[PDB]
Amino acid sequence: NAQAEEFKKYLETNGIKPKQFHKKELIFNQWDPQEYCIFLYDGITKLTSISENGTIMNLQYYKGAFVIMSGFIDTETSVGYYNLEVISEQATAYVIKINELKELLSKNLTHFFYVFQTLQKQVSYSLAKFNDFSINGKLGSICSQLLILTYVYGKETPDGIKITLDNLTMQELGYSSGIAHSSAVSRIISKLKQEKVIVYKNSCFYVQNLDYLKRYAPKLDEWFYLACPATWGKLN
Amino acid sequence: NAQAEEFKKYLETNGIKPKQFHKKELIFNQWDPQEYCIFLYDGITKLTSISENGTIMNLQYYKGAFVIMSGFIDTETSVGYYNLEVISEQATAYVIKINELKELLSKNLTHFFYVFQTLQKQVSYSLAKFNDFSINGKLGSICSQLLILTYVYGKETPDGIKITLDNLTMQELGYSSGIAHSSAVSRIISKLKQEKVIVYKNSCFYVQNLDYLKRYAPKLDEWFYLACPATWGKLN
DNA sequence: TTGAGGCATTAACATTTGTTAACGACGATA
DNA sequence: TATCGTCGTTAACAAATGTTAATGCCTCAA
Numbered sequence: 001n002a003q004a005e006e007f008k009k010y011l012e013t014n015g016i017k018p019k020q021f022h023k024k025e026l027i028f029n030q031w032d033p034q035e036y037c038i039f040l041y042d043g044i045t046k047l048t049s050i051s052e053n054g055t056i057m058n059l060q061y062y063k064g065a066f067v068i069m070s071g072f073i074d075t076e077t078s079v080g081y082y083n084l085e086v087i088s089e090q091a092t093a094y095v096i097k098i099n100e101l102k103e104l105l106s107k108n109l110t111h112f113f114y115v116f117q118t119l120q121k122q123v124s125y126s127l128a129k130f131n132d133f134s135i136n137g138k139l140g141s142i143c144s145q146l147l148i149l150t151y152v153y154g155k156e157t158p159d160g161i162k163i164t165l166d167n168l169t170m171q172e173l174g175y176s177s178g179i180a181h182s183s184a185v186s187r188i189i190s191k192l193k194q195e196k197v198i199v200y201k202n203s204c205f206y207v208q209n210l211d212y213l214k215r216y217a218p219k220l221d222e223w224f225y226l227a228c229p230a231t232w233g234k235l236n
Numbered sequence: 237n238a239q240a241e242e243f244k245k246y247l248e249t250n251g252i253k254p255k256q257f258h259k260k261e262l263i264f265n266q267w268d269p270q271e272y273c274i275f276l277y278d279g280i281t282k283l284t285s286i287s288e289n290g291t292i293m294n295l296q297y298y299k300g301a302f303v304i305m306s307g308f309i310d311t312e313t314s315v316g317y318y319n320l321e322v323i324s325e326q327a328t329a330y331v332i333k334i335n336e337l338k339e340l341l342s343k344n345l346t347h348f349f350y351v352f353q354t355l356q357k358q359v360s361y362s363l364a365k366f367n368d369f370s371i372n373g374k375l376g377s378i379c380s381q382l383l384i385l386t387y388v389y390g391k392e393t394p395d396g397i398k399i400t401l402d403n404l405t406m407q408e409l410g411y412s413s414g415i416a417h418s419s420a421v422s423r424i425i426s427k428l429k430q431e432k433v434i435v436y437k438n439s440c441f442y443v444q445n446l447d448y449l450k451r452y453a454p455k456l457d458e459w460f461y462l463a464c465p466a467t468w469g470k471l472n
Numbered sequence: 473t474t475g476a477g478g479c480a481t482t483a484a485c486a487t488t489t490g491t492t493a494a495c496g497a498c499g500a501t502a
Numbered sequence: 503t504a505t506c507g508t509c510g511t512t513a514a515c516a517a518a519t520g521t522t523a524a525t526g527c528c529t530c531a532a
Contacts, residue, residue, distance in 0.1 A: 047363075049367055049455065051371070051454060052454070055371060057367055057370065057371065059363055059366065059367060060363075069356060069359075072353055072356050072357075073349055073352055073353055073356065074349050074350075074353045075353075077462060078462055079356055079359070079360040079462065079463070080360050080363060080364060080455070080458065080459060080462065081458065082363070102349075106345055109342055112348065113309060113310060113338070114310075116309060116352060116355075117308060117309060117310045117311075119352070119355050119356070119359065120305055120308055120309065120315060120355070122359050123305065123315070123355060123358050123359055123362065124315040124316050126359065126362030126363060126366060127283075127295050127316060127318070127362060128316060129366065130295060130362060130365065130366050130369075131285055131293050131295060133366070133369075133370065134293065134369065134377070134413065134414030135287070135291060135293060135414050135416075137414075137488070137489080137519080137520090138488080138489065139488080139489095141370070169508095169509070169510090170509075170510070171509090177370065178370030178371050178373075179489085179490090180490075180491090181489095181490070181491065181492090182509075182510080183490090183491080183492085183493095183510090183511085183512085184489060184490065184491085186510065186511065186512090187488095187489085187511090187512090188489090189510095190511075190512085200510090203509095203510095218287065218288070219285065219316065222316065222317065223316060226313060226314060226315070226316060227308075227315070373489080373490090373518070373519080374518080374519065375518080375519095405479070405480090406479075406480065406481095407479085415519085415520090416520075416521090417519095417520070417521065417522085418479080418480075419480090419481080419482085419483095419520095419521080419522085419523095420519065420520070420521085422480060422481060422482085423481090423482085423519085424519095425480095426481075426482085436480095439479090439480095473532105474531105474532090475530105475531095475532095476529105476530085476531085477528105477529090477530085478527105478528085478529085478530100479526105479527085479528080479529105480525100480526090480527080480528100481524105481525080481526080481527095482523105482524090482525080482526100483522100483523085483524080483525095484521105484522090484523090484524105485520105485521085485522085485523105486519105486520075486521075486522100487518105487519080487520065487521090488517105488518080488519065488520075489516105489517080489518065489519080490515105490516080490517065490518075491514105491515080491516075491517090492513105492514090492515085492516100493512105493513085493514085493515105494511105494512085494513080494514105495510105495511085495512080495513095496509105496510090496511085496512105497508105497509090497510080497511095498507105498508085498509085498510100499506105499507090499508085499509105500505105500506090500507085500508105501505090501506085501507100502503105502504095502505095502506105
């Protein structure tokens, strides 16, 4: 992205060099809260939370370049206890101390607006996602989450639209929609397989009826159209 | 509170004076989408969306002072098609044109951080709310929404904690949690009535077991502690 | 006093989802 | 080769939620 490359060179002009992480590694976590401004430049990650009773929740995925704040900018305190796990093989991110960030954005306003814009993309995204997961229950939550992955990690193929995401087990989908048991997620997939909506070929998901998912996630599709028009046009 | 007064006097220097609205009135809407930056100064509102088949969704409430973005700052387009209905008798809000906002925040950087902070409070709120409504289904969604209302509109009294909302029908709670039929909301409330969690006096809600709701909304309670510590202290 | 309409409660059914378990396929280690 | 572990189906059962309808309470309007 053009605005992220200029934000890279800027952070590298002020001595904020990149750090490397590998799969399964946590940039920040929920137990040792440290207020950071993560600038995920390259890689794929998921924001998770583990309750006291052990249940895992997959709140959302993040694909670079994007910005994830674990602390506020004025109070410099925590926004919440979450984990940011790397799920791609390797991921590069610039870890910025919350205090210095405040100083970098006051210098240059083009990068202030950039971090502000990406923050607006976060707000609209959560509202849309919250809207679609609530109306139609779990079937809609699985359909809605699949629609997200299809736009971001989808590539057209002979057999539909291939989701280029490894280790997307049944447990990982259930975590995204609040389903605790893999058998429940599976039962829903067997209904979508029978309805010719998707095919689970080779431990990879193929989408053949994009319109059906658009039915159950109208606001999320509306969001990709409005907020990520390039990613949306590639499938329309 | 205090930082909003400085944002008031500031807005009262660049000729962007406040407009007054009454109950049932829509500041912005989904069908005629104008891009504005709302600075709700005083009053109560709800952000809604109406599907194509008429179903209503209540995404969240807003009590001044707060900021609601209906459009992006860089692209100057809409963040999504939503309605912002006034539910209090009278509400005062400063309507800012989206094209003017970018120049106004560059003048004073302390008010830039203010609008930036309130957006981080929006992001954290949506993640927490999304987290708690997903784990335990609809019972948890009603409990979580109730926990929200209890902190923002709750006042301790001899019997229970009064949720001071004039119109809080069964149908309006279902809209907040994705329940389409009021009879389903009632059945859930009848379970909470029998379990000594809440009572129903004068079409008004009273909470007697706040801890029971915290079980079903751990992230939302965590959020009030971190983001609205004053509102949290009033009940702890 | 009469009658209409909104709202809450309850019921009874249909559908979905939570929960536990058995079967069978695949990969890995020795 | 044999055998353990993980993950995906499918089943059966329990529990929650969707859906519709009848009922009773209340305010309003004439």
